[PDB]
Curated annotation (Swiss-Prot):
The chain holds residues 23 to 59 of 59 of the full protein. The record marks K27 as: Basic residue of the functional dyad. Negative results: inhibits with low efficiency Kv1.5/KCNA5, Kv2.1/KCNB1, Kv7.1/KCNQ1 and ERG/KCNH2. Does not inhibit Kv1.4/KCNA4, Kv3.1/KCNC1, Kv7.2/KCNQ2 and ERG1/Kv11.1/KCNH2. Expressed by the venom gland. This is Potassium channel toxin alpha-KTx 4.1. It comes from Tityus serrulatus. Changing K27 to A/E/R: Significant loss of affinity for squid Kv1A channel. Residues 26-33 are annotated as: Interaction with Ca(2+)-activated K(+) channels. Potently blocks Kv1.1/KCNA1 (85%), Kv1.2/KCNA2 (91%), Kv1.3/KCNA3 (89%), Kv1.6/KCNA6 (94%), and Shaker (97%). The record marks Y36 as: Aromatic residue of the functional dyad.
Length: 37
């Protein structure tokens, strides 16, 4: 799933995804985070 959190750095989406679902696996594109459950 993704989050509206306006991400600005690919490496920033890692700590975010981990804080979103629990794992730091995802990227940042289209102004959104792409975390994979």
């Amino acid at each position: 799933v993704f989050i509206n959190a306006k991400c600005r750095g690919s490496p920033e989406c890692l700590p975010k995804c981990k804080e979103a679902i629990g794992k730091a696996a995802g990227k940042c594109m289209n102004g959104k985070c792409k975390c994979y459950p």
